[PDB]
């Protein structure tokens, strides 16, 4: 939906990403919110526009809500729900002394149920990732920016050889084919169990990501990480079937980690 720029308040830079400039302000002087003013010519606008409404009615708990945009001037602005504690790589690293395992499994579980929903919904994320998870000011952890890779306008991110693509997320059938769909979400979240239970280490640390593509396609996988107990790592593990008929559905998924925290 159409968000009247009168009603924000610019108050604080955010930083910068695949879009440009984002900032910190306020909805109506109450609601916090992130403004992403997309820089000119890194997005398909039309592509983005004409397909937007959907993406307004993913509506979750654990999705980073998207609350609408403004389009009637340039830049455009797409403003989205603020969550205080940034992105969930930088928290892992910058925490990573006090997280207790179960508090790493309620993460895994933030994250598959936004997931879960997003699947019903056979809505793909496309990038997902620690980087592309933010964190609020009660450590729940939701899942951002979800589908918005594919109006990239950007040939070192779109390209599957470029330097900014997603590679040490992506099956083998996304590297070689380009073959998105709900198992490549599934094998990204594998990989951000292991970022998470990792503490925020890098996927396949000191590879290339050409070395990270041949190395995956020839069978090789992320090791347990110290924290991950035998049970954790066997779901991680099972996103990471090569053929991807063979992988979870995230409703799998979230029974797995609900079934590991009855246990406990
Ligand atoms: C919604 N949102 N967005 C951002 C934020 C800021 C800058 C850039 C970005 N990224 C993006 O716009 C983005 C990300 C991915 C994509 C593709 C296409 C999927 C690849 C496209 C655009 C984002 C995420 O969308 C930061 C937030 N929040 C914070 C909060 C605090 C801090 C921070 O500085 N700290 C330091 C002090 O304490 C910890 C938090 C940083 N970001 C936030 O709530």
């Given at each position: 939906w159409e968000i009247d720029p009168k009603d924000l308040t610019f108050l604080k830079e955010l930083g910068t990403g695949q879009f440009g400039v984002v900032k910190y302000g306020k909805w109506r002087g109450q609601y916090d919110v992130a403004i992403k003013m997309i820089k000119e010519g890194s997005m398909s606008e039309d592509e983005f526009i004409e397909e937007a409404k959907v993406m307004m009615n993913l509506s979750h708990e654990k999705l980073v809500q998207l609350y609408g945009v403004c389009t009637k001037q340039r830049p455009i602005f797409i403003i989205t729900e603020y969550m205080?504690?940034?992105?969930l790589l930088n928290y892992l690293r910058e925490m990573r002394h006090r997280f207790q395992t179960q508090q790493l499994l309620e993460m895994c579980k933030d994250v598959c149920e936004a997931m879960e929903y997003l699947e019903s919904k056979q809505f793909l994320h496309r990038d997902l990732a620690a980087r592309n998870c933010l964190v609020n000011d009660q450590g729940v952890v939701k899942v951002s920016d979800?589908?918005?890779?594919?109006?990239?306008?950007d040939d070192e991110y779109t390209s599957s050889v470029g330097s900014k693509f997603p590679v040490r997320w992506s099956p083998p059938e996304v590297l070689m084919y380009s073959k998105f769909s709900s198992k490549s979400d599934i094998w990204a979240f594998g990989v951000l169990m292991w970022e998470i239970y990792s503490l925020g280490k890098m996927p396949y640390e000191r590879f290339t990501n050409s070395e990270t593509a041949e190395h995956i396609a020839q069978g090789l996988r992320l090791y347990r990480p110290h924290l991950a107990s035998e049970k954790v790592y066997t779901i991680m593990y099972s996103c990471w079937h090569e053929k991807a008929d063979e992988r979870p559905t995230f409703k799998i998924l979230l029974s797995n980690i609900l079934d590991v925290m009855d246990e406990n």
């Open positions: 205080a504690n940034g992105c979800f589908g918005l890779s594919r109006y990239v306008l």
